[PDB]
mmCIF file of C-alpha atoms and ligand atoms in Angstrom:
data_model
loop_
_atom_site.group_PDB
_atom_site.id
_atom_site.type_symbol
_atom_site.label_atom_id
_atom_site.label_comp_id
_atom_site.label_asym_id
_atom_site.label_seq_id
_atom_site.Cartn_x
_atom_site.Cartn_y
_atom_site.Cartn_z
ATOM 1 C CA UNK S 1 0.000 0.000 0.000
ATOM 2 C CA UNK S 2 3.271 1.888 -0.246
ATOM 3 C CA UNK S 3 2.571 4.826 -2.845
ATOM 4 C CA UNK S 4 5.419 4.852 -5.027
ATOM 5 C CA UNK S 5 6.856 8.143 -4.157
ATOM 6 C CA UNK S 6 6.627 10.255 -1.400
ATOM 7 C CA UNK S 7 7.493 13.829 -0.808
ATOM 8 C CA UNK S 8 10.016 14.819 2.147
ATOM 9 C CA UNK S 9 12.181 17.736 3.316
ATOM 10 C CA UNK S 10 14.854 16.724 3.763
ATOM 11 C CA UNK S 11 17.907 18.221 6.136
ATOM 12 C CA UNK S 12 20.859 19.352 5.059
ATOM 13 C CA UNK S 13 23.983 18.337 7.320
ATOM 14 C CA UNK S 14 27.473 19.638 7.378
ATOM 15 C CA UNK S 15 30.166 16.954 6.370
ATOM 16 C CA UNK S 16 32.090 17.397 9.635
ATOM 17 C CA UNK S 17 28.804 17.571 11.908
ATOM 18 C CA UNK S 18 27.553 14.399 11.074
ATOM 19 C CA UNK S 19 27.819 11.632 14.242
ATOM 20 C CA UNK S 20 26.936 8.225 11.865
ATOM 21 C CA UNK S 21 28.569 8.471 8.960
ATOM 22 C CA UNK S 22 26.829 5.522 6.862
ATOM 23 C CA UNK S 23 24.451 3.119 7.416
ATOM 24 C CA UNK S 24 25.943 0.078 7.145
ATOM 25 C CA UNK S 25 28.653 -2.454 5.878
ATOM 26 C CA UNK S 26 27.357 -3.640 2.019
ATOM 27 C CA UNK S 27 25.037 -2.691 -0.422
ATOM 28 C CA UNK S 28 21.990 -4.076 0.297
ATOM 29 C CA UNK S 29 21.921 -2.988 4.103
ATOM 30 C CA UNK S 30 22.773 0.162 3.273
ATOM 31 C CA UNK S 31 19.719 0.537 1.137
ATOM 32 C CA UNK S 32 17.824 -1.126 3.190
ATOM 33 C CA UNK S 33 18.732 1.137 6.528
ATOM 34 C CA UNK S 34 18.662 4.690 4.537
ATOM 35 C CA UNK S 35 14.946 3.342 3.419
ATOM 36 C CA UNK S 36 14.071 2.772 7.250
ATOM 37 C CA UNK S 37 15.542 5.896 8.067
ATOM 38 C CA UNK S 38 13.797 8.162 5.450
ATOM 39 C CA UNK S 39 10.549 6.410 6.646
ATOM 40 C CA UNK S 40 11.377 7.422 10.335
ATOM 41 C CA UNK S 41 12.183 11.104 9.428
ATOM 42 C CA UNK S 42 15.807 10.476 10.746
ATOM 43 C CA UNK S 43 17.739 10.674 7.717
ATOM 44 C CA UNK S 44 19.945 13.545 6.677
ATOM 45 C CA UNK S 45 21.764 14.424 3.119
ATOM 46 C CA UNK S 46 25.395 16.181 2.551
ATOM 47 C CA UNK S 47 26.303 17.950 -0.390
ATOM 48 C CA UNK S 48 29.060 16.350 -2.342
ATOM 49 C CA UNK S 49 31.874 19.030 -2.646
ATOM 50 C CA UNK S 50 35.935 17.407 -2.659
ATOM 51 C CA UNK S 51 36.838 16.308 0.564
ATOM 52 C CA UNK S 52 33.183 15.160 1.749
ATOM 53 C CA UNK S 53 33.006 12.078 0.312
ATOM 54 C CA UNK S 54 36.284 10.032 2.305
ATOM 55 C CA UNK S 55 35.292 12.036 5.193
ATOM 56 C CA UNK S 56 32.301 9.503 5.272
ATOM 57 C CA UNK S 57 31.987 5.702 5.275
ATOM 58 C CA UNK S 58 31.515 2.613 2.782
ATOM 59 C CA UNK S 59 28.673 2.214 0.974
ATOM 60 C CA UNK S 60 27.631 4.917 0.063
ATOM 61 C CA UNK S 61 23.872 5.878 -0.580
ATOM 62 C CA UNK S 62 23.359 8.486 -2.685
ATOM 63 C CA UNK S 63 20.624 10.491 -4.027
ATOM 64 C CA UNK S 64 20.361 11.197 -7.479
ATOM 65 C CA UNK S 65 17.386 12.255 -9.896
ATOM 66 C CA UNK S 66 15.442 9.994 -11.658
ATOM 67 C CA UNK S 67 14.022 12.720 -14.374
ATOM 68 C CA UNK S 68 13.589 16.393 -15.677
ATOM 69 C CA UNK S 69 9.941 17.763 -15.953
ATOM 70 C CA UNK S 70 8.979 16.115 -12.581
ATOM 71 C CA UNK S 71 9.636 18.782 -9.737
ATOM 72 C CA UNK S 72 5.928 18.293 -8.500
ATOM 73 C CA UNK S 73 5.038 20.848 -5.948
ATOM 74 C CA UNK S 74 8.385 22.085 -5.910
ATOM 75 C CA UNK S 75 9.905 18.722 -5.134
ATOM 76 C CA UNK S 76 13.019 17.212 -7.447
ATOM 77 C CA UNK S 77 12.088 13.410 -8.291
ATOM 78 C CA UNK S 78 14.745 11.566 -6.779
ATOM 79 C CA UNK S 79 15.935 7.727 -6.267
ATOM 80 C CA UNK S 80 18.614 5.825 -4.641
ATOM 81 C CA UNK S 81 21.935 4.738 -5.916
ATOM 82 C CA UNK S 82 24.692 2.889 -3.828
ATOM 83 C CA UNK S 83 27.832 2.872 -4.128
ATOM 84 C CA UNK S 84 30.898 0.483 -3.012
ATOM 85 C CA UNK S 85 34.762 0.392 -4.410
ATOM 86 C CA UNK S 86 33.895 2.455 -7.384
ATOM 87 C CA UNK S 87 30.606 0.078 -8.660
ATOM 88 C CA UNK S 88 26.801 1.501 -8.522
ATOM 89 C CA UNK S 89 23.989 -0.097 -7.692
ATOM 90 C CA UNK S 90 20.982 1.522 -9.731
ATOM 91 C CA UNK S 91 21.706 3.757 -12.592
ATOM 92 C CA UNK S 92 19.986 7.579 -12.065
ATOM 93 C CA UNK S 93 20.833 11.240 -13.060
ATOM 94 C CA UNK S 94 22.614 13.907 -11.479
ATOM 95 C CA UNK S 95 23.653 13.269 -7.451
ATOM 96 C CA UNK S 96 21.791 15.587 -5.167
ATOM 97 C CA UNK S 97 23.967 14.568 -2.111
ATOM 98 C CA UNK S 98 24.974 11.847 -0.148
ATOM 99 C CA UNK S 99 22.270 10.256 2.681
ATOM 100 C CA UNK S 100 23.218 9.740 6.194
ATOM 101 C CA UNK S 101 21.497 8.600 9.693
ATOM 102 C CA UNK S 102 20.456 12.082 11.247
ATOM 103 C CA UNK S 103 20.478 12.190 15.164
ATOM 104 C CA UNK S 104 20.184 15.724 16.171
ATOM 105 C CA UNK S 105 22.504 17.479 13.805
ATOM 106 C CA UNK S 106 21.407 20.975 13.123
ATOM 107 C CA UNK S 107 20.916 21.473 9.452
ATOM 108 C CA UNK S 108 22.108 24.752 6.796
ATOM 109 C CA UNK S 109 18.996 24.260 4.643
ATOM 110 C CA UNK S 110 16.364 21.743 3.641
ATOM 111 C CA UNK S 111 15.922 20.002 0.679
ATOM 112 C CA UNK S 112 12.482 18.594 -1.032
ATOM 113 C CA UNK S 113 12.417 15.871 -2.745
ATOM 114 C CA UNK S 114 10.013 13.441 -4.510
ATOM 115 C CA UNK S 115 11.449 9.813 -3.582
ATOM 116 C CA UNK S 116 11.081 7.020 -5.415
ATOM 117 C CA UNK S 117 10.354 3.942 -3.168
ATOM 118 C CA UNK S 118 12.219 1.193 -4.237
HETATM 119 N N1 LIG D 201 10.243 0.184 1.232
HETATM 120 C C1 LIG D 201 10.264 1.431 1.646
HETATM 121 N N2 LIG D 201 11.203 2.283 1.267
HETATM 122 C C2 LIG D 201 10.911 3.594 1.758
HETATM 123 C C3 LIG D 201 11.647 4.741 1.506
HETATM 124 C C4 LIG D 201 11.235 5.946 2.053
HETATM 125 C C5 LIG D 201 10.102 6.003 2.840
HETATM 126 BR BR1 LIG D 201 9.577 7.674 3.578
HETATM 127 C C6 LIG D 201 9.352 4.872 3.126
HETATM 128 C C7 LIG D 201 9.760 3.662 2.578
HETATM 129 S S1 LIG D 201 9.065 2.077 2.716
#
């Protein structure tokens, strides 16, 4: 009964603020844990500028977009990609940012997206 996507703000988290940086140890936890997470309104996203990305942890789950007329209600369709030793999981559009476990971190900005459940 899942609708198939599902519109969140989401918060934006400084790379060097952020207390869990992943959500797991392979691929398919990873995308497993950032989908319980998104559900639970405790996941956060950092914006991919050098230096953020081996400042976090392996997997990686990214965010990227999954088309180009959809912004519905102001929201940027969106879907997951992961990422381990250089190989994707999923194939998408441009990354957004990189998802994390968000535990009280106070955010720069919010950003809405349209996910795509699995
Ligand atoms: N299978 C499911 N994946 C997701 C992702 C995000 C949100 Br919010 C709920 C669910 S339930």
């Amino acid at each position: 009964m899942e609708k198939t996507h599902v519109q969140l703000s989401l918060p934006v988290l400084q790379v060097r603020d952020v207390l869990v940086r992943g959500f797991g140890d392979s691929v398919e936890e990873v995308l497993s844990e950032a989908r319980q997470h998104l559900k639970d309104g405790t996941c956060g996203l950092v914006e991919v500028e050098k230096g953020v990305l081996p400042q976090l942890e392996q997997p990686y789950v990214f965010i990227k977009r999954s088309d180009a007329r959809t912004a519905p209600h102001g929201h940027v369709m969106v879907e997951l990609v992961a990422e381990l030793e250089g190989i994707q999981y999923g194939r998408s559009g441009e990354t957004l940012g990189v998802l994390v476990p968000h535990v009280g971190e106070i955010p720069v900005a919010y950003r809405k997206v349209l996910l795509r459940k699995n």
